[PDB]
Structure 1
Amino acid sequence: QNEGHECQCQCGSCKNNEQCQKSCSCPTGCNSDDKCPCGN
């Protein structure tokens, strides 16, 4: 029941990858390029 959420990630691998902007693996603290552990 819980898998994707909302990758509003503006990182460098989130802005170019729109295939994970609806199911990324980051919490609600992924709004800055850091240790963003997104999909890949």
Structure 2
Amino acid sequence: QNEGHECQCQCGSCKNNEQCQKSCSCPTGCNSDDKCPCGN
């Protein structure tokens, strides 16, 4: 499915890969590379 959730993380590292967009494992707060726990 969208095995993560709606990522929407304002991190460039997120905001590029539609993989993480739906398959990201970060909290809503993740809008900073510093605090990007994303497995993509």
Pair 1:28–1:18, CA change in 2 (3 A): same
- The CA RMSD measured in Å over matched residues stands at 2.4
Q: What's the CA shift string for 1:5-35, capped at 9, x where partnerless?
A: 1101121211111111012010121133332
Give 5+ residue unaligned stretches, structure 2: none
% identical aligned pairs: 100
- Structure label with greater radius of gyration: 1
Higher helix proportion: 2
| TM-score between the two structures when normalised by the length of structure 2 | 0.64
Q: How many residues align?
A: 40
**3-state secondary structure, aligned to 1:20:** helix
| TM-score between the two structures when normalised by the length of structure 1 | 0.64
